[PDB]
Structures are given as C-alpha cells and as structure tokens.
Design a protein around this ligand. Structure first.
Ligand SMILES: O=C(O)c1ccccc1-c1c2ccc(=O)cc-2oc2cc(O)ccc12
Lengths: 218, 205
C-alpha cells in the first residue's frame, strides 16, 4: 500500500495569514495513463469530509479561489493564500493511483484569535432528576481561547474527581473559540449529604480560577 | 448534486447490515461511488468502490470478506453490506462520489447491549442568561438536539456524548439575553431514533 505522510501534524494560524500543507507519498502518484490521482479533503467539526481539490490542482465547485493545490510525483502541496475562520478542521490527502486507495494521517488547522476567558455556568440537579433518584451537577465553560483549561470540582472545601464526565467541542468557526461541559454524577443521597458545590476553571486569561458555586440548601 | 445515506444502525455481533447511498437522477449513473470507514477521533480508510453502468467493483483486501458493494441503477442507489459484525466494525461509513459529493455518513454500532430511552432534564440557573439541557442514560448513539423546535440556534453549544458505563450522556447550553428569558418561553427538544422517543422539556425558573 502507498503510505501517505502529511506534514505538519497541526497548524495554528491567524486570520488573513497564508497556510501550506504538505503530502508526501511512498510511491509516485504519476499513473500509467499520464494522469496524477491526488485529492485534498477538508473535514469540518461534526461534519463528513468534503473534497476541495481533485487531480492535484482542480478546485471543486464552490471552493474559494484562496485554495490552491500543486505538486508532482511524490510531493504535493495545498495552499491557502489568506486563511479564513471557516477553513478550520482536519485536512486529508487522498491517492487513487494505486490499490488500495489511501489517505494521509491529517493536518489539524486551528485559527488564532485573541485570548478569551470561559463563561462559567453551574447547574444543580433538576427537581425531575431528584424525583427519579438521580443527582447530576452540570457546569459549562463556554467560548474560551486557547484550548488548554483545567476543571476542578470542589465539594464543601474538598476536591472531587469521581463521577466527573468531561466533554469538549472543536473550535467554532463563528468566533474561533472552544467550549466545554463538565458533569458531576452522584447518587441523590451523596448529593443530599453535601451543601457547597464549586466549579473552578483554571485558564491563561486570569490569575487565578473562575469559580462558580451554589449551596444545595439555598 | 448530493448523496443521502441511510439512518444509523445498532446491530448485535455476528449479524450483518446493509446501508444505502442515494444521489440525484444524473451523477450516480455516470460517476464511481467510493465507500470509506472512519472510527471516532481517527483518520480515513478506503473500503472499495463501485462503477456506475457496468456494476464493476474493487475492494481493499482488508474488506474482501467483510464488505459487499452493490448498486440499483433504477433507483440511483448504491449499497454496502457488511457481514459477521465485530466491535471493530463500529464506525462512521461514508459514500464518496468521484465527481465530488460525500454522504453525511451512517453510524454503525456493533453491540450486544440493549436500547435504552434517554432521561431529559431541564437545567435552570441558580446581560445574558445561560440555560441548559441534560440528556442522561441512552443507548446507542446518536441523539438529536434543538431549542424551541429550531427558532433558537445562535447562542447554542451542543456537546458530544461520553461513555460511562452502559450508557451514554450529553448536554447543551443556550445563552440568551436577561430580557429574553423568562419573559418568553424556552423549551428543549430531544429525540432518540432507536428507542422511538421524542421528548420536549420546558426550562422553568
Ligand atoms: O475517484 C477516484 O478513484 C480517485 C481517488 C483519488 C484521487 C483521484 C481519483 C480519480 C481517479 C482515479 C483513478 C482513475 O483512473 C480516474 C480517476 O478520475 C477522477 C476524476 C475526477 O473527476 C476526480 C477524481 C478522479
């Protein structure tokens, strides 16, 4: 099988700057018919891939002219003249000269924006969940930049690591930010044995944590 | 031109599944259709392709005895049958046209586990007010989440699910102005296909 090696692994770029993604094949993509079968795909967050370029340099319909594709033989290049927020995602090269057809490992394109602080929100177990005998405490850390963040759950002055279920989003195009959600699952009883519930966010934007709390008995 | 794939499927190990990929009356009858596999958080793997008129196929050797590619010229539909299903077959499957379009994907869950209906809870808070919706204990993936049937989409962050332990759970946040809520009504709308459940939960102060 033809091994398709993509470089760089990740790329963080400011809006309006140029982007260059490399694809190198283990064998020549120059086919017996004189044609070169190399495609470029972009996978946007929560979406199926979409082809941007086909046969080394042709642009697919609706693909903005800032996208350019070039190369020959074993070396290929995808270029963005001046990047846009809607360009974020994973870039994959696709070869069809040899069988089986193979793809590159991917290149993650992350947009650079001004550092934003998370909007922290805390939510106690709903009355309905408490009726069914369950107890989940939800905490949203919304629209932050950069991605690296730490969510510490404090209960009555002490850290809690068990029952914690964290989930992140991929960078949004609409504002170049990341969002996250944390859930602390306890039994109705464990929940009823404690009072103070804290959601601390440790980021670069502030010194130091962004603390959201509530008292169960209030 | 666009490719519409069949809905998600949960199948027990050892059994077999058949997926469909349908395009507009033009493109499919002249263009090659590829089938690609993608496991969550992973890259792409080519399964094989099928030619339009001649019904000629080509397979990746790894899928020789797993996949079978067929096409119905009359209905502009390509199919992929996977056999003797294993947990390793749990992934997203796409069809991709040589002439450009890709399908939305079809999620396949290979599990012994049983179909569980999701518990939906309204998350009421203790310039702008953030509201929430919790979707706890459901199987398999996926679920569909909208706010106020769809009239709310701008200030919404829907989060991916997490596995613990049978059983998946996900959440969504809606940030509207202090004046919008609770003066006007804001309801959460959740839907699970497998359990045939459609839930609507009003966020109350
Ligand atoms: O569709 C494919 O087989 C394919 C896969 C990877 C790269 C290019 C192609 C591709 C071809 C590959 C082999 C071949 O013999 C003919 C191909 O024709 C194409 C035509 C396109 O419009 C657009 C793309 C192709």
């Amino acid at each position: 099988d033809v091994v398709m090696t993509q470089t760089p692994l990740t790329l963080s770029i400011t809006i309006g700057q140029p982007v260059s993604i490399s694809c190198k094949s283990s064998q020549s993509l120059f086919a017996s018919d004189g044609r070169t079968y190399l495609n470029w795909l972009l996978q946007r967050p929560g979406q199926s891939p979409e082809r941007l370029i086909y046969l080394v340099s042709n642009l697919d319909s609706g693909v903005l002219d800032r996208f350019t594709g070039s190369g020959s033989g074993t070396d290929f290049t995808l270029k963005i003249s001046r990047v846009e927020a809607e360009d974020l995602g994973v870039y994959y090269c696709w070869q069809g000269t040899h069988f089986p057809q193979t793809f590159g490992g991917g290149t993650k394109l992350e947009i650079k924006r001004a550092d934003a602080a998370p909007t922290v929100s805390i939510f106690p177990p709903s009355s309905e969940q408490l009726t069914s005998g369950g107890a989940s405490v939800v905490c949203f850390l919304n629209n932050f930049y950069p991605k690296d963040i730490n969510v510490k759950w404090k209960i009555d002055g002490s850290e809690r690591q068990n029952g914690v279920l964290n989930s992140w989003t991929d960078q949004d195009s609409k504002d170049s930010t990341y969002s996250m959600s944390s859930t602390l699952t306890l039994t109705k009883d464990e929940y009823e044995r404690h009072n103070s519930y804290t959601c601390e966010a440790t980021h670069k934007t502030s010194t130091s944590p962004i603390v959201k709390s509530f008292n169960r008995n209030e | 031109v666009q490719l519409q794939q069949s809905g998600p499927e949960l199948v027990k190990p050892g059994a077999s599944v058949k997926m469909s990929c349908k395009a507009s009356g033009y493109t499919f009858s002249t263009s090659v259709i590829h089938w690609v596999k993608q496991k969550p958080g992973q890259g792409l793997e080519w399964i094989g392709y099928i030619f339009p008129y001649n019904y000629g196929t080509q397979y990746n050797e790894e899928f020789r005895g797993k996949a079978t590619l067929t096409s119905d010229k009359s209905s502009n539909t390509a199919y992929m049958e996977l056999s003797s299903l294993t947990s390793e077959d749990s992934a997203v499957y796409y069809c991709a046209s040589r002439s450009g379009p890709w399908g939305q994907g079809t999620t396949l869950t290979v599990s012994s586990a049983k179909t569980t209906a999701p518990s939906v809870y309204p998350l009421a808070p203790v310039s702008s007010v953030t509201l929430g919706c919790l979707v706890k204990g459901y199987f398999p993936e996926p679920v569909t989440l909208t706010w106020n049937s769809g009239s709310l989409s701008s200030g919404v962050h829907t989060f991916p699910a997490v596995l613990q332990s049978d059983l998946y759970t996900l959440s969504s946040s809606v940030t509207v102005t202090s004046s919008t809520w609770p003066s006007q009504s804001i309801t959460c709308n959740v839907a699970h296909p497998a359990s045939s459940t459609k839930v609507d939960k009003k966020i109350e102060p």
